[PDB]
């Protein structure tokens, strides 16, 4: 699955 | 999806009160909650495989006006709006992603939400 990348968490 | 359906029966109640000015309230503050405000834009993200995976999109924005226009008969109904939410998340995105994460500590405080809600009455 491609996903959504981070998201700086 | 829809934020009214003339087929579906809808009222107020106090509990959908509570999720308005409680539940929805509480999470929209939270700096996790941003990527679930609006419906998951797969074009924006280029995220192709989207739709492909999930087929009953939700998103807090449309959960917010459902509840304004007294599309829900139930808080339960509304509760189930939050998980499809939730768990459209987990299916689509991969388990180590951020967004599981954000997700994770939203539904929580969910959760903990529901737990205090108010007797039907």
């Given at each position: 699955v491609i996903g959504k990348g981070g998201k700086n968490i | 999806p829809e934020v009214s359906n003339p087929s579906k029966p809808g009222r107020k109640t106090n509990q959908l009160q509570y999720m308005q000015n409680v539940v929805v309230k509480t999470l929209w503050?939270?700096?996790?909650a941003w990527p679930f405000?609006?419906?998951?834009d797969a074009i924006k993200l280029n995220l192709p495989d989207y739709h492909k995976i999930i087929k009953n999109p939700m998103d807090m924005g449309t959960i917010k006006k459902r509840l304004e226009n007294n599309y829900?008969?139930?808080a339960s109904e509304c509760m189930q709006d939050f998980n499809t939410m939730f768990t459209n998340c987990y299916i689509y995105?991969?388990?180590?992603?951020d967004i599981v994460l954000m997700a994770q500590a939203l539904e929580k405080i969910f959760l903990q939400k529901v737990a205090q809600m108010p007797q039907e009455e």
């Open positions: - | 503050k939270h700096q996790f405000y609006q419906p998951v829900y008969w139930s995105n991969k388990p180590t992603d």
